[PDB]
Design a protein around this ligand. Structure first.
Ligand code: SL4
Length: 557
């Protein structure tokens, strides 16, 4: 029961990889300490392999089977359809890794018959054969961080023809089943506004609130063949076409349970018997499996009135406190149960009696005040990683714009409004690229977004209070400040000053550009405008957003 076995062949890059922050004319206006920012490369893949390779033991008790029976009972109420070749093709990102069989993501989106002819044959092969392990490519992720140095994460994904077949069999299931099985506990149904509402409401619905986040060590690595067969048995409870049942059975045996790892050069690196990071079912399976283990571990622990919020491997529990030592006892039991279930912790959990101190989906609840003085709650984070990545994206064009995703999801935050919006609107102005659509990743799915729709997207995700927030908390204001001192970012009076400029230049241009200046930078002037609902905002089609997670699922909406 080893997560992985290795041949000794190295995980190879396909293009050269920069580990050091690229510098341009713009870099120093955002960040001075360039030595603090790095990107992970293949060079560290060996250390990741070490970290993720271990023996899993799993001990499964009545709590585990009682929760699973309940989950399957809900799964039975789900009906899911097959997607046609065309539908699945249209879900393929333009930028998506090309097929080994001589065709690419754009050929797939075009419905070019060489692509579609292959896909039909991969599909046919899935129905006929249910035993033959499907090839995966193993690559090192290039992601940017601040030093404190992390090894590259491993992405494992099958060929583009298989990925389109996964969509035909399972897109509708992984879109619809998780909300039916987990109800309000399924995190990816929530906009950031909806998520802060659920957390705060959940917290207040307790007499004596206690909550903790649960950090599983390398959760993909802790997922067993058992866990992956249990997931397929949940999928199989749905009312499915028999062609769909056959495909899900085949993809489970041949791809999801495990299979061989090939590097960029086409050499054999070893064998996987855990979760693939890069398949359609990674989000949904992690979320189901985390919810099953954690739900059963709650019952073991005798946590009273448990509310859970689960996003893939990211887990928050809020429950009734039974005093501090009782709570501390509960959490150790909780941890023993998760360990037996093969989800041992990274940091051991800590009970918390202040909601603002709980981190879940890399975010904490904080509080500011809107126009009318009224307290509004919002999600924020330490902005160290988002700014490190903004620095890197200032000097290199990346196909996913972390800064755009971070503006959309953290729009109400001091740091997103003062730094990210100021910095990136100045760049789009100087290049006159306000009207040029950018790809960004929300809950793993890729979206093409026009920056000039940002005010409308922000009203819909967060409400109009996102444009009027002030009197951020002492503790939020400190963490922003300490991060700027760390990264050598200019102070927030410099950003206010810059934003007055950007605001002025955006109003200059009228149309949506003016709206952007009105709404995004109202905070920068003291003689404030009165901000009121945007007309084009309820025209925006935000169905597809906050339905489901698709991390590593190759999904474009
Ligand atoms: C755009 C980014 C900033 C990356 C966003 C996101 O898409 C994921 C996420 N994407 S994922 O599908 O890869 C995944 C898996 C597990 C946990 C989170 C995520 C994430 O954690 N994010 C930070 C986040 C999440 C929920 C929130 F309400 C708020 C706020 N306010 C902020």
């Amino acid at each position: 029961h080893m997560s992985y076995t290795w041949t000794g062949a190295l995980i190879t890059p396909c293009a050269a990889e920069e580990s050091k922050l690229p510098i341009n004319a713009l870099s120093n206006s955002l960040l001075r300490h360039h030595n603090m920012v790095y990107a992970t490369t293949s060079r560290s893949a060996g250390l990741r392999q070490k970290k993720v390779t271990f023996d899993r033991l799993q001990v499964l008790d009545d709590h585990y089977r009682d929760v699973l029976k309940e989950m399957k009972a809900k799964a039975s109420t789900v009906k899911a359809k097959l997607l046609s070749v065309e539908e699945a093709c249209k879900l393929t990102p333009p930028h998506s890794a090309k097929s080994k069989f001589g065709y690419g993501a754009k050929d797939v989106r075009n419905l070019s018959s060489k692509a579609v002819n292959h896909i039909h044959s991969v599909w046919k092969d899935l129905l006929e054969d249910t035993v033959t392990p499907i090839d995966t490519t193993i690559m090192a992720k290039n992601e940017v961080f601040c030093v404190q140095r992390k090894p590259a994460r491993l992405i494992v994904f099958p060929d583009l023809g298989v990925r389109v077949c996964e969509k035909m069999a399972l897109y509708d299931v992984v879109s619809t089943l998780p909300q039916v099985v987990m109800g309000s506990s399924y995190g990816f149904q929530y906009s950031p506004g909806q998520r802060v509402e659920f957390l705060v409401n959940t917290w207040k619905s307790k007499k004596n609130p206690m909550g903790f986040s649960y950090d599983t060590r390398c959760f993909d690595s802790t997922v067993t063949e058992n866990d992956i067969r249990v997931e397929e048995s949940i999928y199989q409870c749905c009312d499915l076409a028999p062609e769909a049942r056959q495909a899900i059975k085949s993809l489970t045996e041949r791809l999801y349970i495990g299979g061989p790892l090939t590097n960029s050069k086409g050499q054999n690196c070893g064998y996987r018997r855990c979760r693939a990071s890069g398949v359609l079912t990674t989000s949904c399976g992690n979320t189901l499996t985390c919810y099953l283990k954690a739900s059963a571990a709650c019952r073991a622990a005798k946590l009273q009135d448990c509310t859970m919020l689960v996003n893939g491997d990211d887990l928050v529990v809020i429950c009734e406190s039974a005093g501090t030592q009782e709570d501390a006892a509960s959490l150790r039991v909780f941890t023993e149960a998760m360990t037996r279930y093969s989800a041992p912790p990274g940091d051991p959990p800590q009970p918390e009696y202040d909601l603002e101190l709980i981190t879940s989906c890399s975010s904490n609840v904080s509080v500011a005040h809107d126009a009318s003085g009224k307290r509004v709650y919002y999600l924020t984070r330490d902005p160290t990683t988002p700014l490190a990545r903004a620095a890197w994206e200032t000097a290199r064009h990346t196909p996913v714009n972390s800064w755009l995703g971070n503006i959309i999801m953290y729009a109400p935050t001091l740091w997103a409004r003062m730094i990210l919006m100021t910095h990136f609107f100045s760049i789009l102005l100087a290049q006159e690229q306000l009207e040029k659509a950018l790809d960004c990743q929300i809950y793993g799915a890729c979206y093409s977004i026009e920056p000039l729709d940002l005010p409308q997207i922000i009203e819909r995700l967060h409400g109009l209070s996102a444009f009027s927030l002030h009197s951020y908390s002492p503790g939020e204001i400190n963490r922003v400040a300490s991060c700027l001192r760390k990264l050598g970012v200019p102070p927030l009076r410099v950003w206010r000053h810059r934003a007055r400029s950007v605001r002025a230049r955006l109003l200059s241009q009228g149309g949506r550009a003016a709206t952007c200046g009105k709404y995004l930078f109202n905070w920068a002037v003291k003689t404030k405008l009165k901000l009121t609902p945007i007309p084009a905002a309820s025209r925006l089609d935000l169905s597809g957003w906050f339905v489901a997670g698709y991390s590593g699922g190759d999904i474009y909406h």
